[PDB]
Amino acid sequence: AQYEDGKQYTTLEKPVAGAPQVLEFFSFFCPHCYQFEEVLHISDNVKKKLPEGVKMTKYHVNFMGGDLGKDLTQAWAVAMALGVEDKVTVPLFEGVQKTQTIRSASDIRDVFINAGIKGEEYDAAWNSFVVKSLVAQQEKAAADVQLRGVPAMFVNGKYQLNPQGMDTSNMDVFVQQYADTVKYLSEK
Structure with a gap:
């Protein structure tokens, strides 16, 4: 058939309730993740085809970058808590990978301050239990899909996107087939 288990996607042996x-899942340290988000815009192209009543969710991971990696997961929790994901995603990717001006928790915080988030507001969120729970949520979600690498995408806790089983040559054909596949899995 056009869509095939083991081709455009795989099925988790153990579905996530x-x-x-x-x-x-992504990391701001992840070079393929920079490509995915900043060049290919996979997230945005995926959401362009999502059925009505289905939300896209994005979690950060710890395993790249040591202490900065965990700081970035905590900052991403702050972004989620404050609803400012669309103001900090580009400057975090660029600060970590392009300019390499992000080397500490303070440098991460600067991105938020520069994006208009008040200092008191960032600090209160950073140290909040709501944010600790959001960090734990991201970590648990990774364990539950038995995550091995990023970037990665899962649909209904049942299917894992398999970009390795799509075309490489036209970025746009690849991006379209990825987006088409998520929509298919959404309805499956």
């Missing part, structure tokens, strides 16, 4: 409908 109560997972987000569409769940992406």
